[PDB]
Design a protein around this ligand. Structure first.
Ligand code: 7QB
Ligand code: CA
Lengths: 89, 264, 105, 155
């Protein structure tokens, strides 16, 4: 199963459910309702980078191989910190 | 000269001998302050058979008084029987040279060679042949001081006959002289400059003498002054009487040391 | 080798993996599973370059080095409109603010 | 009590290859017999090094510059064991997968002098997170707790 993550500026990010569940906030938003998540305060340049983090995390968690650095450009570092702090990942 | 066992605090075990384990420890005396000591211990307590041969190793070290040979501090004959030695607090040379591989200057490495040369010139003056000169048997008292370790604990533990340290005449004829000590010293100097790499890694003990006899020698260490490698080469003259005396090594090492201090 | 991709159409971005050795056509089968449009209704692009169905992703220049989990490569996607394909149109992501002074040398 | 995370004084030699498979300059840290951390010489990225340790010795690995945590053979602690067939023990040192938040804090820390954290336009909780630098003592506390807890699991 894939999930749709929608940024503040309307960008649709389709990612594997397993990848999205890396974030405890996304996990909490997908369990409670008795799938698609909207983020009014996270813009697309930040949410794209968060999705790259999900890919990275599932690929390299419990790998015996060498793992590369997760790169963060200086320009996005503050917004991405605030995103990670809110998303719990 | 006995010491009062109560003034000895037995510490952690720092090694093993033929006879028993060896421990670090402290010795506070009525005449001087707290002193770090090594305690050799003996498993057996046979009067003439084992207790004699073990107290003999203390007798041997009592003969020597040199700033670069571990001093005997005392013995305890009451059970269990223990020999008390000056502690070299920085432990074994090989481990020390690897730990400080990137932080030790060449001048210090040449100093260690110089100091060992002074102990070996001294041993020759006592008509005493060490037979077990190798980095494994050298101990570090401080950053600027190494010492030959216990003669008893030095035997055949260079790491069985230490073929890769031995002069050809020791391998071929079991001849053991000052001139054969000079060969071993050359190898020990190589060990020091190589930061405690053993000589002839990956070569079988049985093939060493054939390689020696073909004119093969340990190669010039990286960052070894040519004058020093030339001194080592002379120590490894096949013909014992073409080797320098410890006397000449002392003088030439002192000159190479000053030549290095004057450059850095 | 595994390759990590962003498949991008308008304001839509799919995050998916495939192999160097998978074909363009097999990537189109992955898009179909997600966006329910069959391969014959898709065009995939590397920049402006239309990709042939038979080429491997690796042959198109999507490699372990250019398509990483932490830095996926972009594949452009255009669907058939009526009897013709829409033009390749990818909306850029938003841009960050000016770098704060305390984050420069 | 006695520290739970300490080396045992075995004097059983063990040859080890510290392999820095990370892009960080790596500080090997030995826990002595009193469980105190001792720094060893740094390992540049991509460099292996044969080193002499002992069975039952405890090592951990850190970024030399920043003190960020590293894994060794996919875990936090490395314990040399018996050499077998004369085969040296590999210590594969890698980056962990840091949380996105921790990786973000590493990057802001590497760009902003600590005296300037308070000029950044973020909430106070993140100023405090920036100031809570990684350090070995904190990680030893944490690793001790996780070991004490683990040894108490089951009844
Ligand atoms: C001729 N022989 C003898 O006489 C003799 C023989 C045997 C015994 C005693 C003798 N007599 C005397 C001994 C002494 N001193 C002395 C001699 C030896 C010891 N110990 C200490 C305990 N040791 C085991 C251990 O576990 N050692 C650690 C140790 O070695 N460790 C930690 C970890 O496991 C990595 C390993 C590392 O440090 N290894 C080195 C090689 C290393 C270097 C670099 C690296 C790295 S890491 C990144 N880059 C690099 C290059 C990694 C490891 C320690 C505590 C030293 C740090 C056995 C030897 C201590 C000593 O005094 C305090 N003084 C006087 C005497 C006297 F002669 F009786 F008077
Ligand atoms: Ca329990």
């Amino acid at each position: 199963m894939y999930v749709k993550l929608i940024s503040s500026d309307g960008h649709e990010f389709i990612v594997k459910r397993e990848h999205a569940l890396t974030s405890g906030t996304i996990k909490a938003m997908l369990s409670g309702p008795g799938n698609e998540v909207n983020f009014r305060e996270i813009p697309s340049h930040v949410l794209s980078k968060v999705c790259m983090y999900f890919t990275y995390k599932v690929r390299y968690t419990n790998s015996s191989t060498e793992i590369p650095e997760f790169p963060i450009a200086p320009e996005i570092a503050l917004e991405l910190l605030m995103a990670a702090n809110f998303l719990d990942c | 000269y006995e010491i009062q066992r109560e003034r000895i605090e037995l510490g952690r075990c720092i090694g093993e001998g033929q006879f028993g384990d060896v421990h670090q420890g402290i010795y506070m005396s009525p005449e001087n302050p707290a002193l770090a000591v090594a305690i050799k211990t003996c498993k057996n307590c046979t009067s003439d058979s084992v207790r004699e041969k073990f107290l003999q190793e203390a007798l041997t070290m009592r003969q020597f008084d040199h700033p670069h040979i571990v001093k005997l501090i005392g013995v305890i004959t009451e059970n269990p029987v223990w020999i008390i030695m000056e502690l070299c607090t920085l432990g074994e040379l090989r481990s020390f040279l690897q730990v400080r591989k990137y932080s030790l200057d060449l001048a210090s490495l040449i100093l260690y060679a110089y100091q060992l040369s002074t102990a070996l010139a001294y041993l020759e003056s006592k008509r005493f042949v060490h037979r077990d000169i190798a980095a494994r048997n050298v101990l570090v008292s401080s950053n600027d001081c190494v010492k030959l370790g216990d003669f008893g604990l030095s035997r055949y533990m260079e790491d069985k006959l230490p073929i890769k340290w031995m002069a050809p005449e020791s391998i071929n004829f079991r001849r053991f002289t000052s001139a054969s000590d000079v060969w071993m010293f050359g190898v020990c100097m190589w060990e020091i400059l190589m930061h405690g790499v053993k000589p002839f890694q990956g070569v079988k003990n049985n093939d060493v003498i054939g390689r020696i006899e073909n004119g093969e020698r340990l190669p010039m260490p990286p960052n070894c002054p040519p004058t020093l490698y030339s001194l080592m080469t002379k120590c490894w003259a096949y013909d014992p009487s073409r080797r320098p005396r410890f006397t000449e090594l002392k003088a030439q090492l002192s000159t190479i040391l000053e030549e290095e201090k004057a450059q850095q | 080798m595994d390759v990590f991709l962003m498949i991008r159409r308008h304001k839509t971005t799919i995050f998916t993996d495939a192999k160097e050795s998978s074909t363009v056509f097999e990537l189109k089968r992955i898009v179909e599973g997600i966006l329910k449009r069959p391969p014959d209704e898709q065009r995939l692009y590397k920049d402006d370059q239309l990709l042939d169905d038979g080429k491997t992703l690796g042959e198109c220049g999507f490699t372990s080095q250019t398509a990483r989990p932490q830095a996926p490569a972009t594949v452009g996607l255009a669907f058939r409109a009526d009897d013709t394909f829409e033009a390749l149109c990818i909306e850029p992501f938003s841009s960050p603010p000016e770098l704060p002074d305390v984050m420069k040398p | 009590p006695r520290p739970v995370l300490r080396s045992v004084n075995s004097r059983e030699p063990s040859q080890v290859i510290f392999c820095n498979r990370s892009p960080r300059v790596v500080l090997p840290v030995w826990l002595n017999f009193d469980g105190e951390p001792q720094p060893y010489p740094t390992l540049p990225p991509g460099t292996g090094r044969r080193i002499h340790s002992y069975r039952g010795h405890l090592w951990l690995f850190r970024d030399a510059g920043t003190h960020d945590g590293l894994l060794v053979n996919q875990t936090e602690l490395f314990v040399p064991s018996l050499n077998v067939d004369g085969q040296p023990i590999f210590a594969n040192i890698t980056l962990p997968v840091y949380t996105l938040k921790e990786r973000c804090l590493q990057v802001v820390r590497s760009l902003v002098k600590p005296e300037n954290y308070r000029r950044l336009d973020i909430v106070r909780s993140l100023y405090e997170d920036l100031e809570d630098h990684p350090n070995v003592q904190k990680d030893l506390e944490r690793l001790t707790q996780e070991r004490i807890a683990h040894q108490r699991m089951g009844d």
